[PDB]
Ligand binder design. Structure first.
Ligand SMILES: CCCCNc1cc(C(=O)O)cc(S(N)(=O)=O)c1Oc1ccccc1
Ligand SMILES: CCCCNc1cc(C(=O)O)cc(S(N)(=O)=O)c1Oc1ccccc1
Ligand SMILES: [Cl-]
Ligand SMILES: [Cl-]
Ligand SMILES: [K+]
Ligand SMILES: [K+]
Ligand code: NA
Ligand code: NA
Lengths: 876, 876
């Protein structure tokens, strides 16, 4: 029966499957909500790819040469502490790297890809460039270590080509060329070389361990004695026998702990990360740390610090106190504290190859240790560089993004890193440059830990690490410790690397590349905005804290640029600006139109440096869309309180439905207690005159003050016009002066006008009547059928009863325009009180004609009507 | 002739008057917008009340006693440097005080009133308590200085009552009693006493200056020589003949620079501030600094450092070189370096009373200098205390706010400060206390400067200070310098004062007093929220940055508390919660209802730790108000994307118009790309089962993950139910497991059901039909009048054609409820996919019955339908 078929076969709705969430690597092409609702070649495992590579990269030129010197200059306990501090740093860094790795599929590159996809392209580009350069230099430094041991073994025998430095450069160039050859040959060959070096190095470590368990009398003159408790108690203690300190020993040891990201830098060639990187990196760190601690302890409890290389030392046991621990085992290697004696645990770096068995085996271990790390860094650098260049963060380096072969191999990057390493090898004296490279590595580790902390601070639902044990405070502590260790090693190198990081960050944030990766920075932006708004929602309103929160019915924010600039003038950095656009038409097309317009106009607002919000709505007409915006726009206490309208210039030649809707917008704004600002200015193209004739709470006074508080209008002086009575001009002038001095509003002059409430000129009244003519109802000259006109061609038709009952207001508007023409004709901008027409008593056409008559033939003028709630105060 | 009357007489709209902005000190007030729209005893001047008080408070014990010691230890140049540094601190503090005091009317109080009204009651209360205590201690300090000079002048004669440390207390108690008496007498009496002390002190200064232009041979054995250029060139340079440094000298000098707020603590008795405090304080600071500099230079270029007072010191032109500025004038006061000589600039503090003429005049200058400052502190402390107590910030001190007499005089505070000063006088050894009091004053000054900087960083339109020359960077610099100077003297005193300020601030912010003064803190809250939202508006959306932005149709947010808590569970700290309320009725009453409910419900939300926004609207019905909210609610990119509704539990016993409106809310949400979440739980009042059978983009999966994120559901494990095919259970289960492992969604078990698509039980289908019957159209048994029935009692009437076209979907809902009953009966919460009914094809009643049949008789269940835009991702 079909009752037992595939669920979801008898419906259009699709069951969840991986094909709906897969970008490119289809099935059923998951149905849209409308369709359901609308009316009808080389891959490595974690062992060979991560564990082995990190293992080899960590173990370099120090495990077999300089570690004994460290256990000599500092005690066994102090050496263990030095090891454990860097181990803690690398362990926290590895935990953070794992947490970043288990968040999603990592395409290619290493630490760069993780950092850039975690917290964006600025830190990402900075750390990518710095880490790539650090690996390129580390190639030269490991090769220089190889050259040093080669020339040392040649000088031990009878062989020398040129001066020691020149021979070092000559051999190092050859080895770097050979390493470039192996790297170019491909990744499988690199892996084979890596595993053979791993087995040789493990054999060398076993050789050393077996050697320390078989003491011989030939090495008795040396420091070798074979795990004598006297040596243990003697070497346990900080004997710094030169211009050396604990911090300097830590600075010397720290480069050994690096290389933890060799496996993570291969992510572009791993079978799958999110399973390989975490366990491989953690196991590598654990094993390397255990080996370091064990070998340090063994060499400290088996070799004495000072030793004289002569069989002439005797064990006769003659009369001697010999409080030192050298004599307790025998008289060999004693009393070379007066003059510099040849060797021991403080003057010999070959002691590792001494206390062992087969010494050429230890030399081969040296070669393998220093060459595996160089190969790892030489592979690591171009992968990171190519991953960063594919993103085109720095357009100048686009050439190095190319790949070759079946597996994308950056041969240009290989050539570039080979050239950089070769250049740094010819110098061959890199002890000055080593702290800078260590600080670069530390900066990369610190920003990895900060990446985890920052992604955990922002609470993005898409953070979701698969790897547990990644506490955010532990990662923040790891970043802090990385910075501290960076400063401990060569303070000025740390300052310089901070300078480079900051400069690259600024350059990237100025270039502003067009990439969107869902970084933790954007999530943190959202979280900050939400938390700040929630905090603001609990703040009680107060009069001194009032701001003009303006909703402007600009439609497209491009139609009236000058108007939007003017509104921005008294809103930018003070209050809120919402650009309201109402879209009409069929719903399906209008939704797409709004989606396109939102992006386009928000981008235009950002590009033109406007601090405005775009608020598009869909409604059947302008009035109800404005109703939507005036009822619901905003969030919490950031809702608008003022409606800003551009003057309807074409109302004379337009359908009176449109002007009726304009005036109804006025009425609705007054209905829900909004202030209204009407702006009339010439869109084609020093005093600010404020005619404050009616008390609206002070909005018509507050707007021009905010105008003068900006640099654009800083040179314009506010002068005030108020209404008064003749023969009392000075009294009212002084009252106004004291009133706005209590408001601390700077003014240049106050003009009291007594010519208001006087009949305007005959020509002006004739012109107003001529303008009014085609909108009169003329009920006096008509029969009772005019009531039908009052319900069909209306309520915009102008009646005779209201034209006679409001003739005072009409004359006041005309006379006020005459006064504005006579006085404020040469003002930069005019702010004037906006008349309020009582709803249900004044037709739309009469209101619009009042505004036209009052505003005609004037410089930029603002008609303002406040909410009649107090907006100013003179109380503290 | 009425055309020339008062403007605004023939209209209802008023003209701007002072009475419209006056709290209590009439007229007809300002007419409301609705009315125009809706259809039918001691006061001081700045000279006496500020300038004199500040000059008297600044000049204390040091001006006439220890200034010479400072000029002796440090050089003339370093003395001028110390004076200028303290002057810079006090001048920036005075500019900041001026800027704060020229904003609004300052009722009473002093620096407390300014600080509290500028940046709120927390810092305000802290600094009020600290400054009041500091002035109370300073009373005892100045009284102790007066007692010390009295006892010194008594010991110069043969008079002595008891041991010096006890005679000091005996005299100091008497002087503090007399000071309390004169303070209690009244303001006018205190002013007269201050004026006479000012004239006596000016006479003493003139005495010193007149006596320095009169070199007498009787004072020649001492350091007095009378402006010899050798002394000028010799008294430069820092010769510290003790364990004293430059910083210690500065610490000794700084208490002389304080007292700059004496005229600002009298603000409650000034004729008018905003004009008295600025000019008076600045002029007082300038005058005091000029006098300090002149006195330092004069006494440095006139008196030598060391002087062995003896007539036997003569200069008979003996054979000697003596390359020092002692013999160049004469042999007097020469060679007292082997043993400490009796006096001079370094060993004498009475040198001021010696250089001058009449010496008792200088002693009276000492007395006036100490007593005027003590009186100023004793007056200022209770004024600040009673201003702080009138606000009830600390309700334990409410008894100290009451005043007696015509002018409100805090007599209780007077007794309190008298008792504190008397207690500190009995100790009589306050040199340990001194750094604490200096640090208290410095903290007060620093927070004044920070008040100006804060009010300038926030850009409140109501900041508007009347005093220019108040650059905010200079104020920030002054605050930083005040902190630095606080640290320079007695670092641990600075730590202690920071501890007290921090503790008082925490206590006040925990007590949360009910005041609202329009502080700069609230303005900065608004500015920060706006800036963060503007920054967020320029952030491109990404899939892994998606958050659930939910608009919940709660109505009153306390009607369904369990539903509100559940929505909060997956919204708190992640995404946005908007509580939508639709208000109906007449507009005039509904606006007032909305205004009341906004405050009430926002306060209720805050008081229950809910991070939700209240969004009330006025609309004709629920549907169009919800349309308002879905179209316009939110600011920028912080707009809702999901609609959350509670289940209509009473839909059976309700008018079908309401349920039709509910289902139309569903359809409208689906129309504009909104997810819908339906929640059905018992309002009366461990696994999370997710039955997500259709791919909505992942919202049905994302919500219960966010549920498990919270600590309330941290013990609940997500287990998943999907629809599959029999005999392919394991393959589908594995596919689901890998899909949600790529999503990093932790699950306990996956259950695949093949029993879906099978016919439900007979009893359940019978019950569904019985519930359905009352809303059936039954057109098969009727005539063409059913078409009219399908237009009036409609479109909620259920047709037979759709009941047959969607019988499979009905059976699926019933069967799914059976499966939920048998499987998820014990779950803590159930999340299930929400069926999508195609608009125009399924009646409202059929859709509601589908939901009811699906979710009936179950634990708390969520029906979720996502946007069908991708919400999860497995890409990094
Ligand atoms: C940034 C680390 C890159 C390799 N450099 C580093 C590696 C190791 C090691 O153990 O991997 C040990 C040392 S060190 N302190 O010399 O013993 C190294 O410092 C060098 C090496 C050679 C030239 C100059 C500095
Ligand atoms: C916080 C300031 C309160 C007054 N105390 C202060 C005032 C003046 C002055 O000139 O007004 C000078 C000094 S001084 N020369 O440093 O001792 C004063 O320190 C004293 C005074 C007496 C007892 C202990 C400390
Ligand atoms: Cl690394
Ligand atoms: Cl003060
Ligand atoms: K290493
Ligand atoms: K003083
Ligand atoms: Na290596
Ligand atoms: Na004084």
């Amino acid at each position: 029966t079909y009752y037992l078929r595939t669920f979801g076969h008898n419906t259009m709705d699709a069951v969840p499957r991986i094909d709906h969430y897969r970008h490119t690597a289809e099935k059923l092409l998951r149905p849209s909500l409308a369709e359901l609702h609308d009316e009808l070649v080389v891959k490595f495992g974690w062992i060979k790819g991560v564990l082995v590579r990190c293992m080899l990269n960590i173990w370099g030129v120090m495990l077999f040469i300089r570690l004994s010197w460290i256990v000599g200059q500092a005690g066994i306990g102090l050496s263990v502490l030095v090891i454990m501090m860097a181990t803690v740093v690398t362990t926290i860094t590895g935990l953070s790297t794992s947490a970043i790795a288990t968040n999603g599929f990592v395409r290619g590159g290493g630490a760069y890809y993780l950092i850039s996809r975690s917290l964006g392209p600025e830190f990402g580009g900075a750390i990518g460039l710095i880490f790539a350069f650090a690996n390129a230099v580390a190639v030269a430094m490991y090769v220089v270590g190889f050259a040093e041991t080669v020339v040392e073994l040649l000088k031990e025998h009878s062989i020398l080509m040129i001066d020691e430095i020149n021979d070092i450069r000559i051999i190092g160039a050859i080895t770097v060329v050979i390493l470039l050859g192996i790297s170019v040959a491909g990744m499988e060959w690199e892996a084979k070389a890596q595993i053979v070096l791993l087995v040789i190095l493990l054999l060398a470590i076993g050789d050393f361990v077996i050697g320390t368990f078989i003491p011989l009398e030939s090495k008795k003159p040396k420091g070798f004695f074979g795990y004598k408790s006297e040596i243990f108690n003697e070497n346990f203690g900080p004997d710094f026998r030169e211009e050396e300190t604990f911090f300097s020993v830590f600075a010397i040891f720290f480069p050994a702990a690096t290389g933890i990201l060799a496996g993570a830098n291969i992510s572009g060639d791993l079978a799958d990360p999110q399973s390989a990187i975490p366990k491989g990196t953690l196991l590598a760190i654990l094993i390397t740390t255990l080996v370091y601690v064990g070998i340090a302890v063994s060499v400290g409890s088996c070799v004495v610090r000072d030793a004289t290389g002569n069989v002439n030392d005797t064990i006769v046991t003659e009369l001697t106190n010999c409080t030192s621990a050298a004599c307790k085992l025998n008289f060999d290697f004693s009393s070379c504290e007066s003059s510099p004696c040849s060797y021991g645990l403080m003057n010999n770096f070959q002691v590792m190859s001494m206390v062992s068995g087969f010494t050429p085996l230890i030399s081969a271990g040296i070669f393998s240790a220093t060459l595996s790390s160089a190969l790892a860094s030489l592979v690591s650098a171009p992968k990171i560089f190519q991953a960063l260049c594919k993103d085109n963060i720095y357009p100048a380096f686009q050439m190095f993004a190319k790949g070759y072969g079946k597996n994308n191999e950056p041969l240009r990057g290989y050539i570039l890193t080979f050239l950089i390493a070769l250049g740094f090898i010819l110098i061959a004296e890199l002890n000055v440059i080593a702290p800078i490279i260590s600080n670069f590595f530390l900066a990369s580790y610190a920003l990895i830990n900060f990446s985890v902390f920052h992604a955990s601070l922002a609470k993005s639902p898409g953070w979701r690490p698969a790897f547990k044990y990644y506490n955010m405070w532990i990662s923040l502590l790891g970043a802090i410790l990385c910075c501290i260790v960076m400063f401990v090693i060569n303070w000025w190198a740390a300052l310089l690397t901070y300078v480079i990081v900051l400069g690259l960050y600024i350059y990237v944030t100025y270039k502003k590349p067009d990439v969107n990766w869902g970084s933790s920075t954007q999530a943190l932006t959202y979280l900050n905005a939400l938390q700040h708004s929630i905090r603001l929602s609990g703040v009680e309103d107060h009069v001194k804290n009032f701001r003009p929160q303006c909703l402007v019915m600009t439609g497209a924010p491009n139609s009236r640029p000058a108007l939007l600039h003017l509104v921005h003038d008294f809103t930018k950095n003070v209050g809120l600006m919402i650009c309201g656009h109402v879209h009409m038409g069929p719903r399906r097309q209008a939704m797409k139109e709004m989606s396109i317009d939102q992006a386009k106009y928000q981008r235009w607002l950002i590009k033109n440096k406007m601090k405005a919000f775009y608020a598009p709505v869909h409604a059947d007409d302008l009035r109800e869309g404005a109703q939507y915006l005036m009822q619901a726009a905003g969030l919490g206490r950031m809702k608008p309180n003022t409606l800003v309208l551009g003057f309807k210039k074409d109302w004379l030649q337009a359908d009176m439905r449109d002007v009726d809707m304009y005036i109804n917008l006025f009425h609705d704004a007054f209905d829900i207690q909004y202030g209204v600002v009407v702006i009339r200015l010439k869109e084609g193209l020093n005093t600010i005159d404020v005619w404050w004739l009616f008390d609206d709470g002070g909005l018509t006074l507050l707007i021009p003050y905010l105008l003068t508080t900006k640099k654009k209008w800083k040179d314009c002086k506010i002068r005030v016009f108020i209404g008064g009575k003749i023969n009392r001009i000075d009294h009212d002038r002084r009252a106004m002066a004291t009133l706005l001095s209590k408001f601390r509003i700077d003014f240049s002059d106050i003009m009291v006008l007594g010519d208001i409430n006087t009949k305007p000129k005959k020509e002006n009244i004739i012109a107003f009547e001529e303008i009014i003519e085609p909108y009169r109802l003329h009920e006096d000259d008509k029969e009772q059928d005019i009531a039908d006109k009052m319900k069909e061609d209306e309520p915009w038709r102008i009646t005779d009863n209201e034209l006679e009952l409001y003739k005072t207001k009409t004359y006041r508007q005309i006379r006020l325009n005459e006064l504005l023409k006579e006085h404020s004709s040469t003002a930069n901008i005019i702010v004037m009180s906006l008349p309020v027409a009582r709803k249900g008593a004044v037709s739309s056409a009469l209101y619009m004609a009042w505004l036209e008559a009052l505003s005609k033939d004037l410089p930029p003028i603002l008609l303002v009507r406040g909410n009649h709630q107090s907006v100013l105060t003179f109380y503290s």
